[PDB]
């Protein structure tokens, strides 16, 4: 399981929290957590309560500022823990419904370029160890967490458009 310790202020400050499972409300705890800290496991939080806006992807590490964590807009109400990390194996699918040209993956992949032609994804299937797909390439982006699971369409991780350029894998050992 994961374990990491929230700080309502930077630098590890203020008000601090430690959460060890999934959470959709922080607001009692931590009126902001512009800091975060993360011993083992993979965490992702979420700007609005209940996992409904922007996530972020968190990994083991020390981060003293949001912005480092791909933090985009300050606040952060709720935070859920990643689980799975054995096996990881993923196809994407070029349409929804798992139609068009699909491509399997199985570890890190920096530039989709160069392993599949069209930049975005419009369903995929997770069979296991989650998968974190980013807006572009590099991992410099937006990024959405998908579980092991079924997607038909990019709507199930609430996505604003399937345009894909990477995607990482979720491991709790490291």
Known sequence: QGKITLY?????????????????????????????????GCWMLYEQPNY??????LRRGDYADHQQWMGL???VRSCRLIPHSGSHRIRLYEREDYRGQMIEF???????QDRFRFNEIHSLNVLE??????ELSNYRG???????????RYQD?????????????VIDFS
């Open 52 to 57: 409904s806006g922007l996530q972020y992807f």
């Open 73 to 75: 807009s300050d606040s």
């Open 129 to 134: 160890g989650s998968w974190v797909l980013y």
């Open 142 to 152: 937006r990024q959405y967490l998908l579980m092991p699971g079924d997607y038909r």
């Open 106 to 112: 199985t570890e890190d992949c920096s530039c989709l």
């Open 8 to 40: 309502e202020d930077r630098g590890f400050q203020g008000r601090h929290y430690e959460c060890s499972s999934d959470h959709t409300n922080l607001q009692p705890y931590l009126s902001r957590c512009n800091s975060a800290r993360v011993d083992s």
């Open 157 to 169: 991780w609430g996505a604003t458009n399937a345009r894909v350029g990477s995607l990482r894998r």
